[PDB]
């Protein structure tokens, strides 16, 4: 029947669109083997088309060298856009464009073979077998320049990293040969440094055929595969906010493009990939779509794909955000460049991620000193019989008569001869002396005033009541706004308001403030209310945003960007780190729900925050707010692991603090934002102490004071206390101070003094010695803490204080909870009995 | 013309009907009589459309056309596109009894403990008849056990109403009156605890075991732990991948919250293991309690996709979005999910759309941030009341019957609550260390015989008929037979001697990690590959058969892991929990990457025994050493594991000889103690010709926590000439010994601490007592001053042994932000400075 045949043609059209990719000739190695007739000339309704013409369009679009996955996309306009661009007769590239593609393949393979000759076996993680990644990346960048965009920022692992640096970003060949030689000048040898395949670079890309230029950057990274992914996103988002493009901009161009490269085993196996993809369309994190390239060489070291993933493709995780996926044959450079341009066009049209799965192979072992035939003999027997993409592409151009055999040979020896001359120039250089690496501490140094005036406090207070017309405030939120106006004019300022006084005053001075984390708009402890929601309409009001406008109506240049994060730690912390790298003038704070969950971001803390300056010269001013304290809420609601951050600390790389007063926290944040130093800040913040009526500050503590790294009891600095009566000195940090002070007051213990160390790192050596010198009759000193003996500040202070200050801390003893495997007990009642034991020992 | 329109409409409902399904309980957002061709049969358009609307546009949103396997798409199509038989009155009354228990348990706790956190299931009650349907369907298939992992939402409710944890025990937790067994160790919060029981079918004649594992607050961190736990139980039952049958008769039932399922990367890493040979469990049943909120955060700020379950499309799992206010549809989808899992041994996901009746926690006000959502929730009758009215309307039950059944359950709880309230109050004491809970009673022999060494050596050459060995692999096999009979045994062979001898004794040995079959440093060759055919040979598997041909009962399970740390370490931890008699080792490619599994180390490995009474014997092998390969190829962060150490929770070692590593592994496998082992293993030292052991070190010795130089124990060295004592651990010993030999420094001695934790206090004192003329002592290490063993040893050695270590000084690299320098040449100059200071 006629109605019967038309319906089966509709099923065939759907079959090619949905599953044609399973039959596309995408694998250059062809490792897998398993991978009527009278109706062809009859016409069918689609316009009317002959079945033969319908099928040829479908086979060409879906079953040649490109496997298209797009029918999983829920937006019909996105499916239609792809359908219309892939189901057409494509215009062949010009001879000039083909010669340009060959010039890039030439550079890619000849760079690798040169290094094989000069530095045999030495680790370089060659791109050989995946040379088409260079004309593919060139096509991405050129298409971004065609759209008139501002910058392309790249993040990538080790595979062909040295090739991308030299042949895409423009890192001088001489500098790459200087790393191989191990002859580093003083600039190159600064800090502790990192391996050659982890370094970054920047340059200007000039269009070969077009009239535009675009900036190209490549960020630094650790060995930890995919860990840089959220860092790239944050870095790009900060550059977009600065250019007033994208989400927090005036134009929707998102004119800074993330280009993210991956390896096949890492893309499927590392969870941070899913966490980063999850940020792609979020208001607080979107970058208008990332261009992903997977260098799918169908191996991970010695591991076969069947042991690396539980899905058909290494890119199947990208289906979580409905991204289109293009699987392309790495031996077809024209198809590779075409997919790269289509991906940029899709990203520009829908501001969403696009994934390119480039199927290729690894010419050599995992690293150039490894033999891959021991574990993959069949794969390497096939690779051995293979002509590279450069030679195959050259033969195609010679066959078409576009270039001659002599021209191709000449261009090869010209590039080889070029490398030899740069190689010999570098070899002639006088050898720099090799010295032990030195601390970066002195590279960045801090009179900085952080006090504000009464008018500033009052303005921030009044902003909380300058509600939009007809705004219905929630009845339990209204007292917070009214109490803040009261605190601003009368004092008794609590921690939550002191934080907003610091951020609000920075905004009024013209600073961009970005604050985020889990339920951070309201605050986990219902304390912040950075955003308030209309009880009747759901409309939002952000009081601190009013501080971005001067009293005369002019802008300050400042802004308040406050968001609820996704439920992530690894990607969220990575993003905020990257954001502060991308905009050093921004105040960037990430808040943990509880300090106990920041161990989910351990790779970012270890590999970027604590060590990036010494390793790469990369600076970040990110703040981590870690709610911390022994309150009887259990082992996962007690500790931000102070001891781990103090262990990681070295070379003045981070500032670590546990403030005990609202005003000292205010001055800490203002010093951090205004010091001109780009170094992370770790703050152990309160929970119950937010509502401790003793933990409040006077107006003069904000207007006539500064950050105090060491604090004495107010009875000695302002009261009638006698320091000479003190025979026992208790040294502590954080909320336990208020419990020790309450016990001293109850028992009138004039023989005991409590000294707080507000800044845990760097140790305030001079301030501590000066403070202790004011108590001449001290006979015994104790470090008092809530935390178990193997936790808190004792593991580092117990070793460092008697060493740095021998005349003050020889014989320093510890008062704490016993050493524990978990950060606390799970029972509130057990916590309470242990807490009272510390207080009784301290005054016993 | 019209037939092609119908085929497009059929495809449209199958592909996208889920976008129009009535799944959200809150609701926040002429040709009909003609026949068409669709076994191939003709059907009226009205019937085609009816079947499609019922299957895809009612209370169930089906996502399955993304599945690449056509037989899986057909299977779902044939079961959803049919006229379903309505549940029986008895089954409906049973569903109502489950909703009654779920809601009345929550409202009871509200009345008695109004100011206490319980993370109520209210607004998601259908989770209980849904989980009951999963477990009952598993019992219908005659399976052995259902193992549950879940977060905080309705946890206390699941424990009481699904697993059978006594109400009296849950009420005693709320009362804060814990008896000595309940108060053991440091413990954890009530909504993190586990339980076990036997589920008896209501209508069928089978029973099935049901367990619920413990977890930390870290949402989704338990996911790989559940998988490993189930895989170990399957291997023991001889079911699944390493079993005689393919029933995979132990089922993982994994619950999640909507914001955590989309946001936590460990979800993707765990899903990635689902069909892997070394990790598959024959499919996990996933339930997302999708209450469309994450604390105060709206879904639009939690994910970048339409559904919270879209990550499960990475493995082509079918996804069923179901209306939480339709308990019959919820139970039906639960049974279909179990049937799919049994048919295809692949994961199934149920996205149960529901709401959170109260605030995030019962003390939080959600109307400050979600006023519109809570104005809608306030006008809603719960699922229990709505289901009751449906059954009364149909005339199956009376108003009085429903009222009586609810009063009885309430009255039942009151009586248990008052009984618990009458109990005498236990004294509250500070928590105590778990160290003494596990101790070896007597001396444990780990030495073997020459026959055992030779047997393992010969196994490397007992190649299958016609096997072509790679030419660079053949010398490894030959050198091992040589080492077995003549000595000079290297580290790589000593490891296989330990595992092979355990297999010969009947032990299950599971070893895995990144490129672990061959070994990162081309040193292991646990699996060898035929140069001509690709066929694999595993020499240690021959040790699972005695010389007489009988089985030993032992087995060698060796795998290349996925490129994961978090899920792989979580899995091996769970595997070791699931089978305490197994030897379970996870190997880091380089110790530097284990920080990717920090949540597992912090929340499970180092603390699970003290927190939950949960024991694991997992081994972590962390390649470590300063060799000039950079900050991410140098350190397994010794200092972090030593900081985490307390209460004898873990054994931490850095052996310097192959024989001592052999004895360490054998002691660990045979001691009967279930406590993790952290080993800092070598890289260059694998091929150090000085770092070899004699046959007698394996056959006539034991593990030594402290090692002296052989010149004093076996040679002509004079301990009395020593005035400087160097204490160290690991490979730096060989560099210090070489410098001493070169300069004939009889005034200097080098003592190795092989076992870093627990500190070998007695052996250290006994050893140092044999050097009476020592005037100065130094702790010497490669690692920067804020790293290695110094941060803990510098503080603990002068305290535990004051007469030996008062005035102990450090020789190391300066304190550093990264674990080393990035330059090989800079590493070398720093390495020589340590050696020059030590002998200066
Ligand atoms: C397991 C592993 C590699 C295999 C990658 O496979 P694929 O993703 O398919 O990429 P490709 O190599 O096929 O292009 S390269 C890398 C290693 O670290 C090298 C890379 C680096 O250090 O920068 P190595 O020194 O252990 O080999 N390595 C160790 C490793 C483990 N775990 C993490 C999180 N990061 C890592 N770098
Ligand atoms: C952010 C967060 C929660 C929101 C969960 O949302 P969803 O996944 O949609 O679940 P549901 O609550 O809607 O069912 S509950 C949990 C917390 O820790 C409670 C749970 C627990 O501690 O076991 P809290 O004490 O901070 O509230 N919390 C903190 C948290 C942060 N990061 C991780 C990895 N784990 C966590 N437990
Ligand atoms: Ca700063
Ligand atoms: Ca053991
Ligand atoms: Mg690869
Ligand atoms: Mg939720």
Curated annotation (Swiss-Prot), chain A:
Pathway: Carbohydrate metabolism; tricarboxylic acid cycle; succinate from 2-oxoglutarate (transferase route): step 1/2; Carbohydrate metabolism; tricarboxylic acid cycle; succinyl-CoA from 2-oxoglutarate (dehydrogenase route): step 1/1. Thiamine diphosphate binds at residues 159, 223, 225, 264-266, 297. Mg(2+) binds at residues 264, 297, 299. Alpha-ketoglutarate dehydrogenase and decarboxylase activities are inhibited by unphosphorylated GarA, and allosterically activated by acetyl-CoA, the main substrate of the TCA cycle. Both the phosphoadenosine and acetyl moieties of acetyl-CoA are important for activation because neither CoA nor the synthetic compound S-(2-acetamidoethyl)-ethanethioate (which mimics the terminal acetyl-phosphopantetheine group of acetyl-CoA) has an activation effect. One of its GO terms (biological process) is tricarboxylic acid cycle. Its EC number is 2.2.1.5, 4.1.1.71, 1.2.4.2, 2.3.1.61. Acetyl-CoA binds at residues 655, 671, 706, 709, 759, 766-767. Changing residue 400 to A: Increase in KG decarboxylase activity. One of its GO terms (molecular function) is oxoglutarate dehydrogenase (succinyl-transferring) activity. Keywords: Acyltransferase, Allosteric enzyme, Coiled coil, Decarboxylase, Lyase, Magnesium, Metal-binding, Multifunctional enzyme, Oxidoreductase, Thiamine pyrophosphate, Transferase, Tricarboxylic acid cycle. Shows three enzymatic activities that share a first common step, the attack of thiamine-PP on 2-oxoglutarate (alpha-ketoglutarate, KG), leading to the formation of an enamine-thiamine-PP intermediate upon decarboxylation. Thus, displays KGD activity, catalyzing the decarboxylation from five-carbon 2-oxoglutarate to four-carbon succinate semialdehyde (SSA). This is Multifunctional 2-oxoglutarate metabolism enzyme. The lineage of its organism: Bacteria, Bacillati, Actinomycetota, Actinomycetes, Mycobacteriales. The chain holds residues 362 to 1227 of 1227 of the full protein.
